[PDB]
Amino acid sequence: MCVLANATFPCFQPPCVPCCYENNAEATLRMLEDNVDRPGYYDLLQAALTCR
């Protein structure tokens, strides 16, 4: 559902796993800033900001 340029990947599994924010903070923020109208926004947000 969620889209990254020309990716169109399911929002539960982003292509940045793992540590999306640790690897690239700015890219992750730009990733989130253009799916605000996408109903899968909050699960995308959960996926982008979690890692051990």
């Binding site: 903070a25 700015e26 923020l29 989130l32 800033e33 253009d34 605000v36 926004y41 909050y42 947000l45």
Partner: protein, 53 residues
């Protein structure tokens, strides 16, 4: 660091760009670009039912 060797202070500017971090949509700070980006964060403490004596 950078040096100009040419002019005085009252000609150049420091405008830190920083980025990396969402701040807020506050009417007291400007936007950086027109159509805007916008995000979403859930605020805590929802409203609920109880009983008073």
């Amino acid at each position: 660091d950078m040096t100009i060797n040419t002019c005085l202070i009252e000609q150049c500017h420091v405008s830190v760009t920083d980025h990396k971090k969402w701040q807020f949509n506050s009417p007291f700070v400007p936007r950086a670009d027109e159509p805007a980006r916008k995000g979403k964060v859930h605020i805590p403490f929802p409203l609920d039912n109880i009983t008073c004596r």
